[PDB]
Every structure is written in C-alpha cells, then in structure tokens.
Short mmCIF file of C-alpha atoms in Angstrom, two decimals:
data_model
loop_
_atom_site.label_atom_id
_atom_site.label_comp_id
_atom_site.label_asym_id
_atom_site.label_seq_id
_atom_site.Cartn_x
_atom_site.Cartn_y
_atom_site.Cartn_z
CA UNK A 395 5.54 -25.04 8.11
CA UNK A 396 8.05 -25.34 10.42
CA UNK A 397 11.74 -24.18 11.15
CA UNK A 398 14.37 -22.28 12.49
CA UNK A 399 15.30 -18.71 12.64
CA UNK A 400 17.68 -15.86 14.59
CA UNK A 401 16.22 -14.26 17.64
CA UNK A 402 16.23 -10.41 15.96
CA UNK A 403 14.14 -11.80 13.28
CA UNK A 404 11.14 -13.64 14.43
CA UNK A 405 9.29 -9.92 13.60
CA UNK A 406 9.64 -10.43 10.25
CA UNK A 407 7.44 -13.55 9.33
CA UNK A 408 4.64 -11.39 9.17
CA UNK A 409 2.23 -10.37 5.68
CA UNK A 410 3.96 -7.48 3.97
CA UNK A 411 7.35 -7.75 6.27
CA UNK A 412 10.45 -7.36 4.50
CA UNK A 413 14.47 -8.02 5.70
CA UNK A 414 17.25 -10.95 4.88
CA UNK A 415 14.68 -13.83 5.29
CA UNK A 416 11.17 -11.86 4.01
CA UNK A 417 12.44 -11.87 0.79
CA UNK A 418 15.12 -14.19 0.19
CA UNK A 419 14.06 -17.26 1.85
CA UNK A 420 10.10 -17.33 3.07
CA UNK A 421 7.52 -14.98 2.02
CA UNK A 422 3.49 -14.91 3.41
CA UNK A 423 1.30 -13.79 1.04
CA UNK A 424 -0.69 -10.50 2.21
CA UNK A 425 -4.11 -12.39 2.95
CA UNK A 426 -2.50 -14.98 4.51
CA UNK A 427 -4.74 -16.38 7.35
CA UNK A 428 -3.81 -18.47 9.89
CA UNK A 429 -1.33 -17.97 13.01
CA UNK A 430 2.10 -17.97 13.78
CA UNK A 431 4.25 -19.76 16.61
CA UNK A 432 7.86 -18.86 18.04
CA UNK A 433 9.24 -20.33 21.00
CA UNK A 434 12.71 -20.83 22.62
CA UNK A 435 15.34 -23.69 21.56
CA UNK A 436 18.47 -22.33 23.44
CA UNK A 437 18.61 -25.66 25.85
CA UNK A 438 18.72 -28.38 22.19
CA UNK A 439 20.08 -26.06 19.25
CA UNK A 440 22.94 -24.20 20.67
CA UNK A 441 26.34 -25.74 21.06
CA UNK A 442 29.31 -24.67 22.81
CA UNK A 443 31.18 -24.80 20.59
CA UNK A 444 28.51 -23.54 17.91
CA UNK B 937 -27.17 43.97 -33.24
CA UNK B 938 -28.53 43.99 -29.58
CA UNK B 939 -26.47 41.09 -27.74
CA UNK B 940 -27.79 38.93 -24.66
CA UNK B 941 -31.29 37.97 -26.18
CA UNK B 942 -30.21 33.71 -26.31
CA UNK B 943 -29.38 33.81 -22.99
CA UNK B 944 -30.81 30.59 -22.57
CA UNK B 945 -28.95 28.16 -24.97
CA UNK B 946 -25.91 30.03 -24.17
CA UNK B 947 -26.27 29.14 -20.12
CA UNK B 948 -27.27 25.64 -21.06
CA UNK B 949 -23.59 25.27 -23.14
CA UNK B 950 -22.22 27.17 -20.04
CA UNK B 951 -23.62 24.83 -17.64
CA UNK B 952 -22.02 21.75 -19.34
CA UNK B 953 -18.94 23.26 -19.89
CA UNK B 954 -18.56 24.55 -16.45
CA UNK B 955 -19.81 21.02 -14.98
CA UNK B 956 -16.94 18.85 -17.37
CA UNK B 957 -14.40 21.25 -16.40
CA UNK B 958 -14.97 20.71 -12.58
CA UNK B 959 -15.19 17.19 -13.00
CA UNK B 960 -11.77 17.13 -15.31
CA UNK B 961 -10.37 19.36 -12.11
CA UNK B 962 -11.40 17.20 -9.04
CA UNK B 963 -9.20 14.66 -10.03
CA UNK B 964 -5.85 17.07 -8.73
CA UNK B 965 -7.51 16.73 -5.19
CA UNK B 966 -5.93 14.91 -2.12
CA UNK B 967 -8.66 13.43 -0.32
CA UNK B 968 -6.26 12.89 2.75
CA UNK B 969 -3.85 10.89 1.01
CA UNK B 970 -0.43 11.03 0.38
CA UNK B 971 -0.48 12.41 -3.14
CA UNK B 972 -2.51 12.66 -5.48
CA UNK B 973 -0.45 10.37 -8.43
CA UNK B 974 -0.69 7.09 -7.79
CA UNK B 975 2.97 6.48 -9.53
CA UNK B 976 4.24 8.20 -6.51
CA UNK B 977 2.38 6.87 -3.97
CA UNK B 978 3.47 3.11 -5.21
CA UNK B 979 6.82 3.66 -5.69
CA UNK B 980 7.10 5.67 -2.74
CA UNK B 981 5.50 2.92 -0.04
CA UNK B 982 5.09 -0.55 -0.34
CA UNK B 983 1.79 -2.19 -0.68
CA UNK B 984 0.47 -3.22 2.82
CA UNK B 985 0.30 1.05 3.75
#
C-alpha cells in the first residue's frame, strides 16, 4: 500500500498512532506485521508553483 | 453456661469467613498499575499502553 504523505507525519503510520491521517484516512491494525517504507520525493512532487 | 467449649466449629466458620473476606478485599489492590478500576484505566489511556 502505497502513497503520499506530509513530512511531520510519516511518525504516525505506526500500530496504535493517532493524529489527522491515523484516524481519518489510514489506520494499521495493532498486530499488524510487516514493515514500513518512507523516502524523499522533493526532486518529482513539488512544484514551484505548488 | 460456661462459653468457649466449641471452639473448634467456631474456628472452622472463622477460618472461611476470614479467608472469603480477604479474597473479596484483594481485589482493591494495585499490583503496580495505574488504578485499580479498569473503567479508569481505559478511558484514561488508549489501548496500545
């Protein structure tokens, strides 16, 4: 499952993590198992102009 | 009229008692928790702690 999120938030994909995404847009289920990736995309999905 | 001479049945009924009643009381303990209600402890922290 991939996507894209705001710098000050990558923290909160995490099992029991809540903020504006945890529990509004994607939620992990407390035994989730498995692993988590987050890497930079300033270079392709920033604009200029926005 | 002389008292004291069933001692036995009456520390048998003592025992019991005293035994319920200290089971009945352990359950006010802490154990090194938070509280010891679990209402307050759930709607005081989430889950995960």
């Amino acid at each position: 499952d991939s996507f894209v999120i705001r710098g000050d938030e990558v923290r909160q994909i995490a099992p029991g993590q809540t903020g504006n995404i945890a529990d509004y847009n994607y939620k992990l289920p407390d035994d989730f198992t498995g692993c988590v990736i987050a890497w930079n995309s300033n270079n392709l999905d920033s604009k200029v102009g926005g | 009229s002389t008292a004291s001479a069933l001692g036995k049945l009456q520390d048998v009924v003592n025992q019991n008692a005293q035994a319920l009643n200290t089971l009945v009381k352990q359950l006010s303990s802490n154990f090194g928790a938070i509280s010891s209600v679990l209402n307050d402890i759930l709607s005081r922290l989430d889950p995960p702690e």
